[PDB]
Amino acid sequence: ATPALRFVAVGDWGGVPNAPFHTAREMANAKEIARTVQILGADFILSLGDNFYFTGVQDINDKRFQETFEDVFSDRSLRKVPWYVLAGNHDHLGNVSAQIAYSKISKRWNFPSPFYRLHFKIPQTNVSVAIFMLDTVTLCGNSDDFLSQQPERPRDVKLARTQLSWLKKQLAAAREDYVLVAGHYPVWSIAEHGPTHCLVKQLRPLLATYGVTAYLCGHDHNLQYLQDENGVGYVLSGAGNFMDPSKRHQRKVPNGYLRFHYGTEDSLGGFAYVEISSKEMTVTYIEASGKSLFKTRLPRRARP
């Protein structure tokens, strides 16, 4: 077979605060992600934030770890694959420290700090992949899923500047063959929250300049693929648990960017399956019912 790095990217999967603490959408996604890993393979899973709804977790004794995470993603195959996690606004309404500390309890759960670098090598090749995991809440401010806010400006401006500066240096320095950036809030989205102004100003210009293949996010509760004039991909995967059919911000996204949107009210939701070979990164969007919805290809570039 083609030597490839394979991963699932799933966003906004954090169940509900009413027992049984999961939705049939979350369960369907867990079941389909398990089928995907088992038959197509995966090296890891990325969570794109909003891991526990509506106010994250309190501490490492929080039952939501068991009920919303362990009980749902319980297939032996999702347990043998590492998860790399970042936070959304609803995580920040609780204790993000607790989710970080959970890394010391669960072998598969990796959340070493709010933002961090990941480095992978495609097996049997020299082809490497960096993924920079961001905390867009501390970068941009709070943005409640169920209001139409722009994250105005961060609680701690110094921490926002530190993260942005760390990211600029990481991207400038990165020697990997593919570089991906991941965070909760969208740069571009046609949906309920739409483009995050903070990220359009602060993050977007880094992406093309440093040869970033794609930015991955969730926050808008749907599946989207967008691509800009520099060929940068926007993988939006926020349909692990809820669905939102809004196209409210369709006009706030530059003409020609949107390639694919799925927000159907009667969908079980879905996720993205990413495969990276020496030739291209492909992104396959998979509905929780098991249907392939969209596939797109991003050719390998000569990076700076």
Closest CA to 221 of 234, 199, 240, 196: 240
Strand partners, 117: 132
**In this complex, which beta carbon is closest to Fe ion, that of residue 50 or of residue 275?**
50
Is residue 92 marked as binding?
no
Given candidates 62, 145, 176, 275, which one binds Fe ion under the rule CB under 5 A? Answer: 145
Q: What is the DSSP letter of 70?
A: I
Give the contact letters, 16-55, x = binds to Fe ion (CB under 5 A), - = no. ----------------------------------x-----
- Report in angstroms how near the CB of residue 148 gets to Zn ion at its nearest: 34
Which segment (85-93, 115-123, 257-265, 295-303) binds Fe ion by CB under 5 A?
Answer: 85-93
CA angle 169–170–175, rounded 5-degree value: 115
Question: Residue 145 binds what, of Zn ion, Fe ion, none (CB under 5 to 8 Å, by partner type)?
Answer: Fe ion
Residue bearing tokens 């359009």: 200
- Binding to Zn ion by residue 43, rule CB under 5 A? no
Does 53 carry a binding-site annotation?
A: yes
* In the complex, minimum distance from the CB of residue 238 to Fe ion, in angstroms, rounded to a whole number: 6
Element (H, E) at 89: helix 89-92
The C-alpha atoms of residue 223 and residue 294 are separated, in whole angstroms, by 10
Residue 70 interacts with which of Zn ion, Fe ion, none, CB < 5 to 8 Å by class = none
Residue 115 φ then ψ, to 5°? -135, 145
On whether the CB atoms of residues 257 and 236 are closer than 8 A, the answer is no
Nearer to Fe ion, 125 or 152 (CB): 152
Pairwise CA distance, residues 286 & 30, whole Å? 12
90 annotated as a binding-site residue = no
Work out whether 141 is an interface residue with Fe ion (CB under 5 A).
no
Q: Which H helix or E strand runs over 115?
A: none
In angstroms, give the least distance from the CB of 3 to Fe ion: 34
Do 129 and 122 contact (CB within 8 A), yes or no?
yes
Q: Which is nearer to Fe ion, 62 or 220 (CB)?
A: 220
Task: Give the range of 15-23, 139-147, 149-157, 162-170 binding Fe ion by CB under 5 A.
Answer: 139-147
E runs forming strands in 195-257: 214-217, 223-227, 233-237
Beta strands, E only, 4-63: 5-10, 44-47
Q: Look at residue 71 and give the partner it binds from Fe ion, Zn ion, none, a contact being a CB closer than 5 to 8 Å depending on partner kind.
A: Zn ion
CA 20 to chain centre: 25
**Is the dihedral angle over the CA atoms 229, 87, 176, 7 positive or is it negative?**
negative
Q: How far is the CB of 21 from Zn ion (least distance, A)?
A: 8
Smallest separation, CB 207 to Fe ion (Å): 21
Q: Which of residues 54-83 bind Zn ion (CB under 5 A)?
A: 67, 71
184 is in an annotated binding site: yes
**What is the contact surface with Fe ion in residues (CB under 5 A)?**
12, 50, 88-89, 145, 219
Residue positions forming the annotated binding site: 12, 50, 53, 89, 184, 219, 221
**What is the contact surface with Zn ion in residues (CB under 5 A)?**
67, 71
